[PDB]
Amino acid sequence: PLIVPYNLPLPGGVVPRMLITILGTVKPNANRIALDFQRGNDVAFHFNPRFNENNRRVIVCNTKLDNNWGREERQSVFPFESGKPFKIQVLVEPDHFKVAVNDAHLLQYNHRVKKLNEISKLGISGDIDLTSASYTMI
Template sequence: MSEFEVKNMELRVGDKLKVKGRVLEDAERFQIDVGRDPDHLALHFNPRFHDDTDGEVIICNSKCDGIWGSEQRDRAFPFEKGAEVKLTMKVTGEGFEVDLPDGQELFFPDRLGLDTLNYIRVRGHFKVTSFKFS
């Protein structure tokens, strides 16, 4: 399991975050967290290869003052173990548009209303090979 963390950056409405990497061969799950700090996450993006309820599922959520919100579950699952993946997350005024590897788009609403996002963490069964924001 690996972890990649960036602090003290500025991601605002209109900005895009691009993450490229490889899903590990024995992957169970990975996550990309974007927010102010680990206790204030505007977006928790969490693909799971085996969830007890839904099997393969992408779970999105937010965390405010260390407390999780309600999960958004998406059964569209374009991830494969061992595959190279490119994800683009765009910050909009309403939330986050995530471009999935198969061309589909997932939307998660902004529940925290933070002007600036300055914390990103990628962890789990995913190896980051490229990271860019614009």
């Protein structure tokens, strides 16, 4: 098991065909999970499941530039369940990050931060037990 929050270095940044795989279990009373692909202090892609946002479950995605959050992209399809094991796969494609959860396509997020090679770390945080975090080329 891995300590949360966990930093996964992405050597030389991301590139199309890189596949990041995160395995863990949602804690029983979870409130949030976050994945943050970073370019220094900037957050190129924030993927943020929220378990009780005004009694709704929603995934919020966004980018943080110069300490300011941008326009949120919201997904109501919510494949995470409190107490249960999950797999998140993030596939870097030329124009977007493509995300699958438990082998099912969830969402795509268009690149706002376009210097892919400078997105050099992934932060994994929130209400999870983290089992594995790795990457490969496909």
